[PDB]
């Protein structure tokens, strides 16, 4: 579980917010893209895997699962590309709740930036630093350090 | 120590590569931008600070030190903005060598992507995973985890 991430795509303001969640910690990375293509998703994963030890990614839909560009990025970065089928039905709910929380935070910061991308990074910061007590950013570091040790 | 980062700007293919180095570990984050403006630097720091516990940033030049947009991002993210004067003369050398290493890696991957941005992310990945023994990505996690405990 230290290496398991889940992709998630949500929409706001006619744009797409692509999110990666570290399953065990709830820590997130996100970016704003005009639309979700295999190429965008591939690039996002390359970025993520250079920053954290990404072992497995549960893809957000069947098009990204199928995408040869996404498969090429996962090959390149040594990531096991998996489906995102919620065999544990609780997964759907957690993701839904996370998207609603993220959108809430984006609304709370929306007037502090002209561009949606800025508001999204502000939301990422707030989400990752929120003590719920440890923050998600604290949990991910502890989890991975324990793994190295 | 666990919270100090150094900004660094280097050029390739008529584009700018903006880099943040975690001083204690040598772990890096980087992005390709058309030119180094206060706004680009501010957005980059916002991204970085949402992902790692950024306490202090040594800015890469006086323009980014002066930039009110950069100061506004440092205020927003709770970062102490500092100069990057190399009071320790070893700093210039270390940065220079890192830029040289990064450009070498980018050359080694350059034909595996059409776009420079992709090559740069591949280079970040290789740099952060390289065992020197531990990798920089291992070092940063251990340093921050030790700090949390
Ligand atoms: C499609 N490309 C195929 C290619 C072209 C030439 C040489 C090798 C390859 C190859 O298959 N390499 C191995 C591989 C695939 C994925 C990771 O490694 C790779 C690629 C992917 C995503 C991108 C890219 C690029 C690029 O070519 O630079 O460019 C930036 C873009 C930004 C996001 C957006 O704009 O959608 O995301
Ligand atoms: C300049 N802006 C001032 C502003 C405009 C409107 C409302 C509030 C503010 C304000 O001062 N907010 C507090 C603050 C400043 C920095 C961090 O928080 C903030 C901003 C900065 C960098 C960016 C931005 C934006 C943006 O407005 O969205 O947009 C994307 C861009 C991408 C990189 C590139 O294209 O250069 O980087
Ligand atoms: Cl964090
Ligand atoms: Cl890594």
Automatic annotation (TrEMBL), chains A, B:
GO biological process entries: DNA integration; DNA recombination; establishment of integrated proviral latency; proteolysis; symbiont entry into host cell; symbiont-mediated suppression of host gene expression; viral genome integration into host DNA; viral penetration into host nucleus
GO terms, molecular function: aspartic-type endopeptidase activity; DNA binding; DNA-directed DNA polymerase activity; endonuclease activity; exoribonuclease H activity; lipid binding; RNA stem-loop binding; RNA-directed DNA polymerase activity
Cofactor: Mg(2+)
Recorded topology in the membrane: Lipid-anchor
Keyword entries, A-Z: Aspartyl protease, Capsid protein, DNA integration, DNA recombination, DNA-binding, DNA-directed DNA polymerase, Endonuclease, Eukaryotic host gene expression shutoff by virus, Eukaryotic host translation shutoff by virus, Host cell membrane, Host cytoplasm, Host gene expression shutoff by virus, Host membrane, Host nucleus, Host-virus interaction, Hydrolase, Lipid-binding, Lipoprotein, Magnesium, Membrane, Metal-binding, Multifunctional enzyme, Myristate, Nuclease, Nucleotidyltransferase, Phosphoprotein, Protease, Repeat, RNA-binding, RNA-directed DNA polymerase, Transferase, Viral genome integration, Viral nucleoprotein, Viral penetration into host nucleus, Viral release from host cell, Virion, Virion maturation, Virus entry into host cell, Zinc, Zinc-finger
Compartments where located: Host cell membrane; Host cytoplasm; Host nucleus; Virion
Transmembrane segments: none
GO CC annotation terms, alphabetical: host cell; host cell cytoplasm; host cell nucleus; host cell plasma membrane; viral nucleocapsid
Domain Integrase catalytic residue range list: 1-144
Domain of life: Viruses
UniProt entry tagged with the keyword S-adenosyl-L-methionine: no
Catalysed reaction, written as an equation: 3'-end directed exonucleolytic cleavage of viral RNA-DNA hybrid; Endohydrolysis of RNA in RNA/DNA hybrids. Three different cleavage modes: 1. sequence-specific internal cleavage of RNA. Human immunodeficiency virus type 1 and Moloney murine leukemia virus enzymes prefer to cleave the RNA strand one nucleotide away from the RNA-DNA junction. 2. RNA 5'-end directed cleavage 13-19 nucleotides from the RNA end. 3. DNA 3'-end directed cleavage 15-20 nucleotides away from the primer terminus
Protein name per UniProt: Gag-Pol polyprotein
Native source organism of the sequence: Human immunodeficiency virus type 1
